Paper text:
Here, we describe the biochemical and structural characterization of a seventh deubiquitinase family, which is distantly related to proteases for ubiquitin-like modifiers, but has a different active site architecture and is truly specific for the cleavage of ubiquitin. We provide a detailed analysis of [name] (Zn-finger and UFSP domain protein), the singular human member of this family, which contains multiple UBDs responsible for the specific action on K63-linked chains. The active site Cys and Asp residues of UFSP and ATG4 are conserved in members of the [name] family, while the catalytic His is absent. Human [name] contains four predicted C2H2 zinc fingers related to the ubiquitin-binding UBZ-class, followed by a predicted MIU (motif interacting with ubiquitin) region.
For getting further insights into the unusual active site geometry of [name] and the basis for its K63 specificity, we solved the crystal structure of a covalent complex between human [name] (residues 232–578) and Ub-PA to a resolution of 1.7 Å. The reaction product of thiol DUBs with Ub-PA resembles an intermediate stage of the protease reaction, in which the distal ubiquitin (poised for removal) occupies the S1 site of the enzyme. The [name] structure forms a globular α/β-folded core with two prominent helical protrusions. A long 29-residue helix (α1) points away from the active site and provides the S1 binding surface for the outgoing distal ubiquitin—here occupied by the covalently coupled Ub-PA. The α2 and α3 helices form a hairpin-like structure protruding from the catalytic core in the opposite direction. This region has little contact with the remainder of the structure and might form the S1’ site for binding the proximal (substrate) ubiquitin. As expected from sequence analysis, the positions of the catalytic Cys-360 (start of α5) and Asp-512 (behind β5) are analogous to UFSPs and ATG49,11. However, the catalytic His-491 of [name] is provided by the start of β4, whereas the catalytic histidine of UFSP and ATG4 proteases would have been expected between β5 and α10. The interface most critical for proteolytic activity is formed by salt bridges involving two acidic residues of [name] (Asp-406 and Glu-428) and the two arginine residues within the C-terminal tail of ubiquitin (Arg-72 and Arg-74). A second interaction surface is formed by the second half of the [name] α1 helix, which binds the Ile-44 patch of the S1ubiquitin in an orientation similar, but not identical to that of the Rabex-5 MIU domain.
Author numbering:
A (entry chain A): 240 to 468, 473 to 578
B (entry chain B): 1 to 75
The structure:
Amino acid sequence: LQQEEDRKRRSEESRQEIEEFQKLQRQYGLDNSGGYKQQQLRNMEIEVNRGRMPPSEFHRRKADMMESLALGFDDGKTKTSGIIEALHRYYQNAATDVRRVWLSSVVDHFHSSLGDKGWGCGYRNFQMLLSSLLQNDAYNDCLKGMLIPCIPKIQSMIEDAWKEGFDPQGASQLNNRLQGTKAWIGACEVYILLTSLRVKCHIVDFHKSTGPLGTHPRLFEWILNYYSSSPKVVCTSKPPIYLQHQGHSRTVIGIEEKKNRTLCLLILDPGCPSREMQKLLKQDIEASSLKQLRKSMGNLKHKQYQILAVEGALSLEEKLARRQASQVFTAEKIP
Amino acid sequence: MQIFVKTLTGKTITLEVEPSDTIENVKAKIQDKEGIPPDQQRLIFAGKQLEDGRTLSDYNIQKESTLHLVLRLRG
């Protein structure tokens, strides 16, 4: 009799497991249900079906999209330039509560398109970081004037790193395939991607909070030490910092030392639409517009953050040493 | 009792556990089988992320239940 009862129980556990598995696979982009190309087209088709887009332009945006995918180049439609320069002007000229502020070099903001909205953050943060390297002469040899790659090309380039031998454990976690998927990525993928391009970088794993009320003072202090080294506003040469938490990533482009001695990060978000970033390019920024960029310790209460920071270029020998090191993938842990 | 732990690629292992085992203990049992450090593990059941100090009994885990194992920090 209990055999039947056991069957009923297992049959319900199975329906529950199957349902949650499919949900999680979809969320993380691992259910192998297509990729950027399909989502762009499906989401443009919705705009046509909602009478918000003529079929002719659809044919045109689809044509553009296909050229970009063929070339592997991001088409720049989600790019906003000039933010570092605008911030420089603001901190220099405007009355602020800042004692000193350190900024990364020039950084282009990239937000998701209809093709990667919901899952592209890691890739878009890579684009923002790469845009800084591409204007930094120290990376000219290892990046030889490459262009910002499109998301499918970034996926191909991560696969290329896996094929070279980088991080086989991480590769297996993502079915050894990213093209044609909407897979979430993390600092580990960005690390092997940059390392495969002979860019010297490293991950720091802030694996638990270090301050009261769940704050991460060690993270803020690490970033302060990264950016700092006389003027009130210091526009440094340094690339921005890739910042990962569970479910989403962002790009840290600077840090303020407030007059009250507290620290405040300046963070770009690939979820921010163009029209919001454009507000920062208006003559005389509105201090209320800067609040979205400013994150104090109270705003960073995820349990775990990983940063990926870039430090220069690698010789081939150094790259190969790092490839081998990536077989047992570890990162500096703090605390 | 026996439970299953399934990654999002479908890799499945079986664990021997008791209802009083903490999620922390379960992550250790996963490390024992797969070599994955607990810090790299996030366990999901019934749509909720399981917390280290809670026990399997806190979540109504039962024989042949399946926990889903998310690995590393992605987004």
